[PDB]
């Protein structure tokens, strides 16, 4: 329920997380969700991103209504310091 923002500096083209979901998937009610955080992702976020967080936005792009491919493309096509708006699982 809590909304919070994280800032993650991409290395090796990676946020160090994996995501599931999309309006046309069976995951929850169509949102984008953090499925795993690998130690690189924990480091980039100073421990603040967690499995089960819903990803609401990437920088200026809202993920409302995104398909899985749209969310992945949005997450991939950015660099340097990435801003994520999240909702606690």
């Amino acid at each position: 329920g809590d909304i919070f923002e994280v800032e993650l500096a991409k290395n090796d083209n990676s946020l160090g997380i994996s995501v599931t979901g999309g309006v046309n998937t069976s995951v929850r009610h169509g949102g984008i969700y953090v499925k795993a955080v690998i130690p690189q992702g924990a480091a980039e976020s100073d421990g603040r991103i967690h499995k089960g967080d819903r990803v609401l936005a990437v920088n200026g792009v809202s993920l409302e209504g995104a398909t899985h491919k749209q969310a992945v493309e949005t997450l991939r096509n950015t660099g340097q310091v990435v801003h994520l708006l999240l909702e606690k699982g």
Partner: peptide, 8 residues
Amino acid sequence: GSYLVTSV
């Protein structure tokens, strides 16, 4: 049932 996981 079935879902896709994508590392980013």
